[model samples]
Target: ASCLELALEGERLCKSGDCRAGVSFFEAAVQVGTEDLKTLSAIYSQLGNAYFYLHDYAKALEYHHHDLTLARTIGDQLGEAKASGNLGNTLKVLGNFDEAIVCCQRHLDISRELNDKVGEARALYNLGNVYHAKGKSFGCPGPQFPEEVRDALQAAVDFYEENLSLVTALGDRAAQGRAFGNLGNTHYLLGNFRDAVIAHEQRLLIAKEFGDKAAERRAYSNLGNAYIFLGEFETASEYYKKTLLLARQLKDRAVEAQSCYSLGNTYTLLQDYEKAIDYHLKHLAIAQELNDRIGEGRACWSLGNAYTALGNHDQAMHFAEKHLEISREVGDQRNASYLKTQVLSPDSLFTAKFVAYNEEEEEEDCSLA
Candidate 1:
């Protein structure tokens, strides 16, 4: 059918990061897909993913629900699981924590039964993160869910290692790097800064070794975060600077914002308040220039942290208030709440960036995200 052709075309654009184009194609396909349940379901699923990467969760929820309709109608196990997991993620973004937990649980159980180890691990990780997010557990012994979060993260790392072995046996360096990058994040959540650095470094090497500039930039940014947590200020600065240089070279606004945030956080950890505030302000300026609401919100929060580090309470509160407003508007409940909770603990001990690089968390039923 003509709709199938359009959906296939959309897949190519989606893979190339042209999510806006992909969404358009999917919309066209869906319009012509009224009589084709399978085609409609797949199109809606792809549309959900496209909108997700574009930070358009409202659209993501829309199409994901559409996909669910077909999946339920056909009683397709994998399709059902996929829709459930995606729906859970959409709910997570919307801050419907309880519903997200339930949906993810169903997906995870099915993934495990299917021997979808990667899916199982990721689901466990996400569900664990839900609890950690709710409990406000960072590193160390948490009151309830953080420990489970840690376990889930560890499980993910183990599975990635498994995935790495399988893929590398066929010389799949790209897949290995992808797995390694996620493994690095898992350690980062576990508060294992050293392991986090090693994992990310491996990923960076593989990406660069393979001429993957995109992957290299991401790994570099992550490395900056890891080094900052490890109290290696100079190294963190170096990595952030590297990421900034690459992001600018690529003329990528999203990567630029992320790199700027990393650089600002590095300076904050280094006690270079002026420099930190400068970079945070730089990020804010870039965010506004690009109309990147999410970036603007995060930059504001970083600005608040910079001011707090400078012992400027009034200035700190000002930025915090701005961050809260922007975050609410953009549906960034998790990071926004992370900032809000800081208002309670104004003491010297809690002034640092993060207690660990990657904090451990659990899964519901899946892999990667």
Candidate 2:
């Protein structure tokens, strides 16, 4: 087959969600050796994208570098900008934030020079994502939110806002929705719950307008989380119910499990132990079904706490023992030891230790995006 034919087949496979298979055809296209620099550049770009989808970031970077070099050699400014943007995203995924920023800035600069509004918007969005990730890195390992972390997050907010404005002007509702979603997430991380709610509501509106069920579900989940932080348990539960309904309709078991877990947590906050137990049991069953041992362990822990709250020592001990067993099975020695000492002890410091554990665990699970 010709290089074009091979590349086309690769593109078809990639579009059909067979990126692993698509990669071989892309490799073949490269091996076939097209003399046309434009065709070669395109093939390299496609290969980069295919490898990115397959989570092979090193290969993605290599091909994107080839695409960039070819685009520059041919004086294809638009292609150069696109290649830079692709490189920026791949670098962001690889945690090379500084280089990613440079590449995205180049994409933005070239897009501006060419008056390419769409490309400019894409570049801004990529920059936002890179900055957001950089900020998250600084905030990890502890709860110390430093000045640099806030600055990076603020920069992300600015870029995302700019992207939102540009996409709204371009009448690109989908891009607008994505910008709002990112903005919502950044705001939530910054502890700006009200701002997060506003952005997420905009995302939800756009998702509903386009009938995008997946996006709508994400919006609902994010909104529920924001409301939870705002101390509105009832409101949070309502949104969680919406998320659960959408998760069920979409047949997304992972999301369904998450919704159940969130609902369980919310009911616990509401002091509705029975409702909490029900949701936790559902979460446990789903986790077991999905072979998600970590999730099963969490559900068991939550169930034990709920039963303990109800003064049902027998049921509480049963679930606590299950939680410890799963923790050991999952090789979480720290958690296993902690549960054995604090939860299973004769003194039974379950409530205090449970609250501490619950807070730490739920923080990790609260944000979906």
Candidate 3:
């Protein structure tokens, strides 16, 4: 078959969500050869996207690079800008933040030059996402400085704010909603719970306006997290309940589990040990069903703490032992060691002192969605 025919078939398959089949046609198109550089560039871009969808980032990078080179050689400024943006997103996913930032910056510059408002907004949003990921990379399993993390988060905030303003000016409600959601998440990361609340509230309003149940669920979960940071356990539980209802309606078991975990922690904060144990047990059942060992460990730990708070030594010991078993199975040395020393010690007797450990784990269950 001709290159054009093969490419068209690939596009149809990809649009229909069969990227693996699409990739075969794209590869055939590439092998058939085309004299038209523009057509070749477009095929390369499509191949890049298909590979990206297939989770083959290395292949995606190679095709995107081909697209970029061809676009540059053909002097196709618009094509070059689009290829750059795609490369930026792929690079961000690959954790090449420095290079991603450069490509996205170029995309933004080209969009501005072309007077493409929508393209500019897209570039801005991508930049925000890259910076946010970069900030998060500095945390966990590393010795990175806190200042560097804060700076990256601050950069993300700036980009998200700029994107929000631009999207608002363009009257693009969906883009505005996305910008608000990211802004809320960044604010939460920055310890600006009040700012996070404001941003998440705006996101919730937009989600409601569009009748987007998933987005509404996310907004509710984020609001609950912000309220938790503000020391408002009652309000947090209310939002978690709303999230739980939505998750059940959406048939999203992962989110339903998350909501139960959040509610358990919130009730624990409210000094309602029985309620905390109830919710924690719900979370534990889901975790076990899902075979999520880490989640099971966390649920067990929370249940243990709740039982200890209620002076139920037998139940507390049972759950603590379960938590330790799961923690060891999951190779989570930190949790296992901590549990052994704090809760399972021969002399400890599941004292009230273990309750303090509850607060530390609470925020870990808060969904950033």
Q: Model 2 clash pairs? A: none
Candidate number that wins on TM-score, 1 or 2: 2
Give the per-residue lDDT of model 2 (tens digit) for 278-298.
988998999999889988888
**lDDT (tens digit, per residue) of candidate 3 on 73-140:** 98988888888888888898899999999988888999899999988888889889888889878745
Model 3 TM-score (2 dp): 0.87
What is the C-alpha lDDT profile of model 1 across 22-99, one tens digit per residue? 778878988887576766778888888778778898998887887777889887777778888888877877878778
Error of 2 at 295 (Å): 1.5
Q: Give per-model CA RMSD.
A: 7.8, 7.1, 7.4
Task: Give the whole-model CA lDDT for all candidates, comma-separated.
Answer: 0.69, 0.78, 0.78
By summed lDDT, which 10 consecutive residues of candidate 2 come out lowest? 356-365
**Which consecutive 10 residues in model 3 have the weakest lDDT in total?**
356-365
- Once model 2 is optimally superposed onto the true structure by TM-score, how far is the C-alpha of residue 164 displaced, in angstroms? 1.5
Q: Please estimate how well model 1 matches the true structure, expressed as its whole-model Cα lDDT.
A: 0.69
Instruction: Point to the candidate with the largest TM-score.
Output: 3
Flag the better candidate by TM-score, 2 or 3. 3
> Candidate 2 overall Cα lDDT vs. reference?
0.78
Give the true-structure RMSD of model 2.
7.1
